[PDB]
């Protein structure tokens, strides 16, 4: 008399990946396994009463592989195990892009250099964590929106690096916000907008 887990969903942002499910356990515990094929199963969260399991350490080993997960239900320590398969998950194609942050927007002469902070992830290589830019390379684009604080109409520009060098009218203050987008995706394509930064 156990309840099969249901509504198994992947919650992932910048590769930080957690599998979630229902229900809150009642006299039972769960074990979650992960694999990349059929017979590659590895248990990661053993007999927990939690309804989530962080699987980051596993998926970051290779963010472009497709992972399968299964959640087993077992009777608790008081008085055939049921299990359910999760949806497939491919990190590189599905992790959500986190909110960007503008690092600086220095105006030198008639130009403003807008630099986006590179974001470190849990994905590591050569004994070092990788930045979002490191992982995606040119697959990642930043859209900039800018406007004169003293006017209505916005302007825009894009870059496949982390900086924008834009012309501005002298003696004018502009506001800026950036957004990340992965053109090759069909869903979860964009991040939310960065906080707005304004000159002066």
């Amino acid at each position: 008399n156990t309840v099969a887990a249901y509504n198994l969903t992947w919650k992932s942002t910048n590769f930080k990946t957690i599998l979630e499910w229902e229900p809150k356990p009642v006299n039972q515990v769960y074990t979650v396994q992960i694999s990349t094929k059929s017979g590659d199963w590895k248990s990661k969260c053993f007999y927990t009463t939690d309804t989530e399991c962080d699987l980051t350490d596993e998926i970051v080993k290779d963010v472009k592989q497709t992972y399968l997960a299964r959640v087993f239900s077992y009777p608790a320590g008081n008085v055939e195990p049921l299990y359910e398969n999760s949806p497939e998950f491919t990190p590189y194609l599905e992790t959500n892009l986190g909110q960007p942050t503008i690092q600086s927007f220095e105006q030198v002469g008639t130009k403003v250099n807008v630099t986006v902070e590179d974001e470190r992830t849990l994905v590591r290589r050569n004994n070092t964590f990788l930045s979002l830019r490191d992982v995606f390379g040119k697959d990642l684009i930043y859209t900039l929106y800018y406007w004169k604080s003293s006017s209505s109409g916005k302007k825009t520009a894009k870059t496949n690096t982390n900086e924008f060098l834009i012309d501005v009218d002298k003696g004018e203050n502009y506001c800026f916000s950036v957004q990340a987008v992965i053109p090759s995706r069909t869903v979860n394509r964009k991040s939310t907008d960065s906080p707005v930064e304004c000159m002066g």
Partner: antibody
Amino acid sequence: EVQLVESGGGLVQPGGSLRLSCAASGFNIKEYYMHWVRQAPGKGLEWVGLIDPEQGNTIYDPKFQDRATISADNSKNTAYLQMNSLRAEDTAVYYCARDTAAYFDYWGQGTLVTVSS
Amino acid sequence: DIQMTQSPSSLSASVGDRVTITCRASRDIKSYLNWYQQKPGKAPKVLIYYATSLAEGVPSRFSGSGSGTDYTLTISSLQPEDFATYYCLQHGESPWTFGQGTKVEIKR
């Protein structure tokens, strides 16, 4: 299956306003940037503007900034274009296009606006 | 804005001929230059994006090259179905700007 269907075309009196809609299906417009592009009879493509349904940001070509309004309704998954004080040169086929940030990958069928009395 | 000058305005070529169309920007556009093909009574269709990338499903006879201010669309061996008007588009910054187009006529 992605589809963009425009409507609102037809006659507009000189000095009047065209008011068009672009109904999208098969995807959520908030995932992309939606643009309007027009083409006068026998002439070239002309960019009008874009709207980012993520937050409603709109960018207009300077030629249309003071006479047009682009908007979007995520709940109706529809984008719109209104342009005012129309003259003969505004008679054209108006297209709605989906922008992936790399290119336009889907287009509406286009709708003709004829400025006439 | 950034003016895009497309050359020639029209050309006539036989099936099997190599065809070259060029687009020059008034200033560096950093390869955010696409090529679109438009047939009679239809919406434009992407051929090349980011200056040199062939869009999915587009025949290999179409290719793009260039960087900075100068770009070229090449059709290595013209086919009858390539009759169309071709347009370049600068989209790295607003306002986005289209070239004036090149009408390709087929000699037969």
